[PDB]
């Protein structure tokens, strides 16, 4: 119901916009296609409906591939939780007892 009607707006924006009322809508179809291919900007297609917002997650964004990643091999009773900090490791290691205290206080 959402996705079905988003897809109809996207298909309309990429082939048959009706925003401008003459030959300029055929140039607007190319503008909507270009924006969708770059994965940015806005598919304007009718004066009565919001534009098709384009991100790099949109199907027509050409800047996509698949790559590879290792899965984790540690188990839930290993207790291993990762925290990433806005800190350099020499600050983390020198604060490490104060960080253990602070995490213990965050554990009540």
């Amino acid at each position: 119901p959402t996705q079905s009607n988003q897809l109809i707006n996207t298909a309309s924006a990429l082939s048959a916009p009706t925003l401008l009322g003459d030959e300029r809508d055929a140039i607007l179809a190319k503008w909507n296609q270009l924006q969708a291919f770059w994965g940015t900007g806005k598919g304007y297609f009718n004066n009565n409906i919001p534009p098709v917002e384009f991100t790099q997650e949109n199907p027509f964004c050409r800047f996509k591939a698949v790559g590879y990643s290792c899965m984790p091999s540690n188990k839930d009773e290993d207790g291993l939780v990762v925290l990433v900090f806005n800190k350099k490791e020499t600050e983390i290691r020198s604060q490490q007892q104060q960080l253990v205290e602070s995490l213990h206080k965050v554990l009540g």
Binding site: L19, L34, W38, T40, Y44
Partner: protein, 55 residues
């Protein structure tokens, strides 16, 4: 003769094309030789470990 927001999104694309290209350049500066040295070292340190083990 267009809605003004379509000019603003032409200006937004004239920012975004540069943000992709500047990162395509940041990638086009990267070098594998540090990762090739890791394979250079893995041969040398295996041979030096075998000289140790055999001795």
């Amino acid at each position: 003769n267009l809605p003004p927001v379509i000019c603003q999104d032409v200006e937004n694309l004239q920012k975004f094309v540069k943000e992709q290209k500047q990162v395509q350049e940041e990638i086009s500066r990267m070098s594998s030789k540090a990762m090739l040295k890791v394979q250079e070292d893995i041969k040398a340190l295996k041979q030096l470990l075998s000289l140790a083990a055999n001795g």
